[PDB]
Amino acid sequence: HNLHITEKLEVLAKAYSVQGDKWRALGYAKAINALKSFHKPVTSYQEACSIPGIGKRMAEKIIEILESGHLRKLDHISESVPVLELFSNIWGAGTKTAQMWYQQGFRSLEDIRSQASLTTQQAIGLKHYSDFLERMPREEATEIEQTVQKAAQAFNSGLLCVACGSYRRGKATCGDVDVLITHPDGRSHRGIFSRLLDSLRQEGFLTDDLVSQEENGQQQKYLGVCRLPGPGRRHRRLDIIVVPYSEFACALLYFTGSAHFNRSMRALAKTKGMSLSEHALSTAVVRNHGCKVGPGRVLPTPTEKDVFRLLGLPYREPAERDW
DNA sequence: GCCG
DNA sequence: CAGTA
DNA sequence: CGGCAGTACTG
Ligand SMILES: Cc1cn([C@H]2C[C@H](O)[C@@H](COP(=O)(O)OP(=O)(O)OP(=O)(O)O)O2)c(=O)[nH]c1=O
Ligand SMILES: *P(=O)(O)OC[C@@H]1CC[C@H](n2ccc(N)nc2=O)O1
Ligand SMILES: [Mg+2]
Ligand SMILES: [Mg+2]
């Protein structure tokens, strides 16, 4: 749809990402998307360069696959890449940890299990290695959001619970369940992680915690593992955010994504002198190297339609925000 | 990697 | 803070 | 030349 050159460029982009080339991998990912998001198959080098996201270097790699049906660079990928990919797919381990485990001589999850030094999160990630690479049907994500909502609404009926991420973008499968919690009164959303997590543990729903700062009263997120009851259940990842009602549209926009749509909209805000985050859309933001020097003023954004409007953009329903 |  | 998210 | 989103835990 309408190119197989992306299949070859994805192998080389995955290789740079696992090796830590964060920015070289990004350039490849944007070129891959531009190639998947195009009408007529690319037949010329000038036709390849005309597309935004494809430069001279990327066009000549596309001209090599068109002429030869083979990209020479793939025959000289580091032999470590499959192992680094295997290790970075552990929750809590990234490019740095995987490179370190590789230098130390580990080549399998058996060597990680028996010989590696694992963090608490890395040990939970390894314990659910397959389940965590598995996507659930959106119907199970409904069961999970309904579980979190029932426990949250049980102690405070006014609480608003919404499933975001891929679920809200109408996707058929979900990597995890992203639940946003808020309160229309603007003050009762405070200190509910204590009660909500307590409640979900009493019923044996939460199996493990990955990120959960419960010592602080200003805990913003919960990242953990859950499992619905009955046979045939797998362990599913859960992501909960509790936000002030005033920041609802921005938190809802942020948490619906995609990650690439948020980046694209935030980069656009930067060009209009504004700043967009999960908390607020700000204006008159002073910047130096593109870093915040001044705070600016928060703009009133009661709904997601106001964020698009204040940025001079037409509204995009969640399903049209995949990129 | 790409682009201002 | 660097790593990971 | 140099930024590539902006922010939240963990130890
Ligand atoms: C990972 C990531 C997520 N987010 C936002 C947008 C995502 O839609 C939202 C939820 O995070 P994710 O759950 O990682 O993404 P997802 O729901 O789109 O897809 P998946 O089915 O793979 O779970 O958080 C960012 O803004 N930046 C990031 O780098
Ligand atoms: P993890 O499962 O990859 O991430 C869980 C949540 C999703 C939103 C948040 N996140 C992840 C990565 C980045 N770069 N920024 C974020 O806000 O962590
Ligand atoms: Mg990982
Ligand atoms: Mg998700």
Is the domain A258-323 a CATH 3.40.50.300 member? no
**A223 Cβ inside 6 Å of ligand 2:** yes
- Listed in sequence order, the residues at least 6 apart from A4 whose beta carbon sits closer than 8 Å to its beta carbon are A65
Is the domain A1-80 a CATH 3.30.1450.10 member? no
**Per-domain residue ranges of chain A:** 1-80, 81-134, 135-257, 258-323
Point out the ligand 1 atom lying closest to the alpha carbon of residue A165: 17
Round to whole Å and give the CA distance between A94 and A148.
Answer: 29
Crossing angle of helices A56-68/A22-36, nearest 10°?
Answer: 60
Round to whole Å and give the CA distance between A243 and A278.
Answer: 9
Question: Alpha carbon A67 to chain centroid distance?
Answer: 36
* CATH no., domain A81-134: 1.10.150.20
Mention the CATH class of domain A135-257.
alpha beta
Catalytic residue among A22, A30, A61, A171: A61
Point out the ligand 1 atom lying closest to the alpha carbon of residue A237: 23
- Is A61 catalytic? The answer is yes
Q: Which amino acid would we find at residue A64?
A: E
The resolution in angstroms reads 2.4
Contacts 24+ apart (CB under 8 A), A208-216: A208/A124, A208/A127, A208/A128, A210/A91, A210/A92, A210/A121, A210/A124, A210/A125, A211/A121
Is there a common fold for A1-80 and A81-134?
yes
Round to whole Å and give the CA distance between A40 and A260.
Answer: 24
Round to whole Å and give the CA distance between A228 and A144.
Answer: 7
Q: Which amino acid would we find at residue A202?
A: Q
